[PDB]
Write an enzyme that holds these catalytic residues in place. Structure first.
Site, PDB file in Angstrom:
ATOM      1  N   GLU B  58       0.818  -1.201   0.000  1.00  8.53           N
ATOM      2  CA  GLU B  58       0.000   0.000   0.000  1.00  8.53           C
ATOM      3  C   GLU B  58       0.863   1.267   0.000  1.00  8.53           C
ATOM      4  OE1 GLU B  58      -2.032   1.384   3.510  1.00  8.53           O
ATOM      5  OE2 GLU B  58      -3.875   1.572   2.356  1.00  8.53           O
ATOM      6  N   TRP B  80      -8.297  -2.444  -0.690  1.00 10.22           N
ATOM      7  CA  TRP B  80      -9.007  -1.306  -1.272  1.00 10.22           C
ATOM      8  C   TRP B  80     -10.164  -1.691  -2.184  1.00 10.22           C
ATOM      9  CZ3 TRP B  80      -8.778   3.760   0.015  1.00 10.22           C
ATOM     10  CH2 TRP B  80      -7.704   4.164   0.829  1.00 10.22           C
ATOM     11  N   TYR B  94      -5.172   9.514  -1.539  1.00 10.27           N
ATOM     12  CA  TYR B  94      -3.789   9.648  -1.067  1.00 10.27           C
ATOM     13  C   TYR B  94      -2.687   9.812  -2.107  1.00 10.27           C
ATOM     14  CZ  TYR B  94      -5.935   8.037   3.338  1.00 10.27           C
ATOM     15  OH  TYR B  94      -6.728   7.876   4.455  1.00 10.27           O
ATOM     16  N   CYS B 146      -8.332   9.656   5.973  1.00 12.98           N
ATOM     17  CA  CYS B 146      -8.337   9.518   7.431  1.00 12.98           C
ATOM     18  C   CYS B 146      -7.032  10.094   7.963  1.00 12.98           C
ATOM     19  CB  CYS B 146      -8.509   8.060   7.861  1.00 12.98           C
ATOM     20  SG  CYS B 146     -10.191   7.452   7.719  1.00 12.98           S
ATOM     21  N   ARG B 166      -7.795  12.200  11.473  1.00 14.05           N
ATOM     22  CA  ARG B 166      -9.131  12.710  11.805  1.00 14.05           C
ATOM     23  C   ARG B 166     -10.092  11.692  12.413  1.00 14.05           C
ATOM     24  NH1 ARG B 166     -13.189  11.040   8.617  1.00 14.05           N
ATOM     25  NH2 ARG B 166     -12.674  10.150   6.572  1.00 14.05           N
ATOM     26  N   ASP B 169     -10.272   3.879  13.882  1.00 12.87           N
ATOM     27  CA  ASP B 169     -10.847   2.657  14.419  1.00 12.87           C
ATOM     28  C   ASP B 169      -9.651   2.069  15.177  1.00 12.87           C
ATOM     29  OD1 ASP B 169     -11.496  -0.044  14.852  1.00 12.87           O
ATOM     30  OD2 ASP B 169     -12.452  -0.273  12.897  1.00 12.87           O
TER      31      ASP B 169
HETATM   32  O1  LIG Z   1      -6.543   4.744   7.631  1.00 11.14           O
HETATM   33  C1  LIG Z   1      -7.637   4.495   8.145  1.00 11.14           C
HETATM   34  C2  LIG Z   1      -8.895   4.544   7.422  1.00 11.14           C
HETATM   35  C3  LIG Z   1     -10.095   4.318   8.101  1.00 11.14           C
HETATM   36  N1  LIG Z   1     -10.115   4.056   9.406  1.00 11.14           N
HETATM   37  C4  LIG Z   1     -11.475   3.940   9.971  1.00 11.14           C
HETATM   38  C5  LIG Z   1     -11.942   5.210  10.685  1.00 11.14           C
HETATM   39  C6  LIG Z   1     -13.443   4.988  10.776  1.00 11.14           C
HETATM   40  O2  LIG Z   1     -13.665   3.925  11.732  1.00 11.14           O
HETATM   41  C7  LIG Z   1     -13.881   4.497   9.386  1.00 11.14           C
HETATM   42  C8  LIG Z   1     -14.000   5.671   8.403  1.00 11.14           C
HETATM   43  O3  LIG Z   1     -15.190   6.492   8.703  1.00 11.14           O
HETATM   44  P1  LIG Z   1     -15.381   8.052   8.469  1.00 11.14           P
HETATM   45  O4  LIG Z   1     -14.304   8.619   9.278  1.00 11.14           O
HETATM   46  O5  LIG Z   1     -15.399   8.621   7.103  1.00 11.14           O
HETATM   47  O6  LIG Z   1     -16.668   8.414   9.075  1.00 11.14           O
HETATM   48  O7  LIG Z   1     -12.653   3.681   9.036  1.00 11.14           O
HETATM   49  C9  LIG Z   1      -8.958   3.962  10.205  1.00 11.14           C
HETATM   50  O8  LIG Z   1      -8.947   3.684  11.406  1.00 11.14           O
HETATM   51  N2  LIG Z   1      -7.763   4.192   9.513  1.00 11.14           N
END
Ligand SMILES: O=c1ccn([C@H]2C[C@H](O)[C@@H](COP(=O)(O)O)O2)c(=O)[nH]1
Ligand SMILES: O=c1ccn([C@H]2C[C@H](O)[C@@H](COP(=O)(O)O)O2)c(=O)[nH]1
Lengths: 264, 264
Positions: B58, B80, B94, B146, B166, B169
């Site tokens: 990635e 993806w 990205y 993110c 921002r 998870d």
């Molecule tokens: O690099 C990444 C991409 C996504 N997520 C997670 C964040 C959220 O749980 C969900 C994306 O949701 P939104 O932030 O758009 O609402 O996937 C991560 O932890 N890391």
């Protein structure tokens, strides 16, 4: 302010020597986060007298998407004179990016309005962001944005905001940067019928200039006083309708002001 | 990882209930910062087995400014697939913003190269930043970035990096996000003849999904094992010339993997 003085000490105790743009050396740390519960009081530094007057005008100036210092001058605010060109223009700085971010296809994005829309219609969004870091326009700005990026967050009817500041002069700039965004949070919260939550400050290169040591030690010897309270005299119809006289800070009893010179 | 498990507990103990996009509830906190001294070892979670294989592909895919999943597919990496359209396109995500940020006047900015130039010619700069948050192109992306913004910092021959995420998870995404940027730091440092410093992780809406509680409690009962070491088999001529086989992690002895399902 307790969190603020702690940062100052940290820079002193742990900062590494690093020079700035062809000039003064600094004591620098990279990566720091501070949290202010806005419900506890308005985060205006009390260990030295800070004047909100210019901060308020600057914020209202940002909101109008204004990028020429004329408005600041009508009010005798000279904090941007240093950077304005002969005509009073600063380039596509803060105000321009916040209200009219230019797209490649000819559009101009109003991030402030977009953010208002999100807080009112999609409060649980994890994408409520305003960025002033416009890569394609950096060369035209009088200076690259220091507070470059901020995100909003809603939980339990409380609006929080996190600011990412790439560069930070702890002594001179920080007291002002905190008050500026804390004000914005109160304004946004009022407009969206939400209570104020936390203001989270995140900084990149956080530093103290070498010729500010005496002032820092002087301030560090002082004891923080209770935080004042911010009062908004009335609720305008929109975030763009605020006026200087709408704000009043109550209970602010700071220690004497401390001047800090800068090299040229 | 000590810092990681501490965050998990924090989300459990202090997180507020908040729902995500028309679905699963989450326990959410706003504003968190973590620091990893890269000299202490490669920050790859040991309390559960994590596979670097897809992370590396990635990253190399990001570096090539590639925005179609074809390369990932040639290597059987399907992380993806969920977002790619019928043609395999993800929009200006990205890779596109990192290598070819489009300007209003028709130019395409290579932020990776700009950053390399700065670290080599102006290491003391407080403006060494790469942003993927392109406001004007957000509507065209498969999803808003993110990890939206990161800044580099040099002091005493050591390269540090701070990432602003921002949304996060904690269970599923974070272990991967940390390893991805920690790798990038090693690559950048190698190319600029600098030692690795700290990796500072800053998050906005940091959360744990409600249907991952058992997995979290299970992981929290485990004891962190020593961190592995990252090995770069050779030094390519440029940041764009790295190959999957150039990396090898030594001393990684994690606990069994833990699956975490997602609702649709
Ligand atoms: O690099 C990444 C991409 C996504 N997520 C997670 C964040 C959220 O749980 C969900 C994306 O949701 P939104 O932030 O758009 O609402 O996937 C991560 O932890 N890391
Ligand atoms: O809102 C602001 C604007 C500037 N500064 C400081 C940061 C640095 O000390 C100097 C700007 O230098 P560069 O970051 O561009 O190098 O002014 C602040 O503290 N806050």
């Amino acid at each position: 302010m307790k969190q603020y003085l702690e940062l100052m000490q940290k820079v002193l105790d742990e900062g590494t020597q690093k020079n700035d743009r062809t000039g003064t050396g600094t004591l620098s740390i990279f990566g720091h986060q501070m949290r202010f519960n806005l419900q506890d009081g308005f985060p205006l530094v009390t260990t030295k007298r800070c004047h909100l007057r210019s901060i308020i005008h600057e914020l209202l100036w940002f909101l109008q998407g204004d990028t020429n210092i004329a408005y600041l001058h009508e009010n005798n605010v000279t904090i941007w004179d240093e950077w304005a060109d002969e005509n009073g223009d600063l380039g596509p700085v803060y105000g321009k990016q916040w209200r009219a971010w230019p797209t490649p296809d000819g559009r101009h994005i109003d991030q402030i309005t977009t953010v208002l829309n999100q807080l009112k219609n999609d409060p649980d969004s994890r994408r409520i962001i305003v960025s002033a870091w416009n890569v394609g326009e950096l060369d035209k700005m009088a200076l690259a944005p220091c507070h470059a990026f901020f995100q909003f967050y809603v939980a339990d009817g409380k609006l929080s905001c996190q600011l990412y500041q790439r560069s930070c002069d702890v002594f001179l700039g920080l007291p002002f940067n905190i008050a500026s965004y804390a004000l914005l949070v109160h304004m946004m919260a009022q407009q969206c019928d939400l209570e104020v939550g936390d203001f989270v400050w995140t900084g990149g290169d956080t530093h103290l200039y070498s010729n500010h040591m005496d002032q820092t030690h002087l301030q560090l010897s002082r004891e923080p006083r209770p935080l004042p309270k911010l009062i908004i005299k009335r609720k305008p119809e929109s975030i763009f309708d605020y006026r200087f006289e709408d704000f009043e800070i109550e209970g602010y009893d700071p220690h004497p002001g401390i001047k800090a010179p800068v090299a040229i």
